[PDB]
């Protein structure tokens, strides 16, 4: 059985349960849209590629609507497009793979009246970041009964991966297929209480974020995206402005100038 | 002749210049304004031997007219060589010659008496 779940104002609704004479036939999603950013040279062969980029896609949701008159069928037309179609867009995801959600907005599709009572419909959610992330962040524990993590999420099966850390030097293991970087509007925030001057250098990728004042274990330091903040008060002309990010697969992060460092990362996995 | 004749600065040696873009080909003139001629050359095989000698200064033959090239804008794209020509009829070439001498205070002059006084001791030809 396939059916289709819709985030929506916070709330989970299923297709099927919302619609009882609306059911899933089947779902697919179209390849990543690859497009490298030519340049040509007159007179020489072929391009310069530059650097690869990825455009929106479609995902797509054949359906059939069985209802049980014409007036019947009518309402539940415009039921659906009610439901369907919001101002701004929402979340998506499917039986088949229930760990991978997609950032979407419908697109315009037309119900096919075959009889009195049945129409055939083939939604299609335009996702224009170009690319599918995890139901989950990286805090949520990696257990059985938070019921979030499936197969095929490209995690790990020969260590153990914990995203908060006690020491000044670790390894973070981002499972994506993107390198996380908060300059391309991904979503990446970092946590950290110690005592001392802070600076966080990601070996593996170079970076290195630097706070040029004196912290304390009760002030809460918070990287979100491209803004530091130390309780939720922008600091970013004391820093060096500096930003980290993730590289794929395995990280090695040296923590220098603090004591009792406790970091924690919070992410969510980008998948294509 | 219709085609265009083109004589180096040196006027060691005058050929014809061909392969033409006579689409581009315009002649401007504009009473006591302008005479000039305008068009685009692309490097060809028929051409590429007397292609280095058309720029600036060379001097073009049109219909018995000789135009002095005054702007030329060579452009490559890929194998495409092109020069855009804009020459100015030799006349205003007379702007070359100056007559640094006054004839001071206020005279009834003639046509005949000013040109006179404008195109002596010419070295120009004109």
Sequence with gaps: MSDLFLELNGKVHSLSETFPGLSVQEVSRQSPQLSMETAEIAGTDGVIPGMTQFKPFIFSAKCNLQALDIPDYHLAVREIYEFLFQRDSYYIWSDQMPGIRYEVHPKPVDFSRESDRVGLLTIEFDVFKGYAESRGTSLDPMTFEVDLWQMGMNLSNRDDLFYVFRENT???????????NPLMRHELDIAMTANGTP??????????????????????????????????????????????????????????????????????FIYR | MDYVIIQSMDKEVEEILTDIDYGSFSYDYEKNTSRAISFTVNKTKQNAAIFDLVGNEAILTYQGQQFVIKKCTPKSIGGTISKQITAQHICYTVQDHVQYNVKSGRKKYSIQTVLEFALQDNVLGF
């Design chain 1, 170 to 180: 670790f390894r973070v293991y981002n499972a994506g297929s993107d390198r996380v």
């Design chain 1, 199 to 268: 600076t966080i250098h990601n070996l593996t990728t170079g970076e290195s974020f630097e706070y040029r004042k004196e912290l304390q274990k009760t002030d809460v330091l918070l990287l979100n995206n491209i803004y530091p903040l130390v309780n939720n008060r922008r600091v970013g002309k004391d820093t060096n402005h500096g930003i980290i990010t993730l590289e794929k697969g395995w990280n090695d992060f040296e923590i220098k100038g603090v004591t009792d460092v406790t970091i924690a990362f919070n992410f969510p």
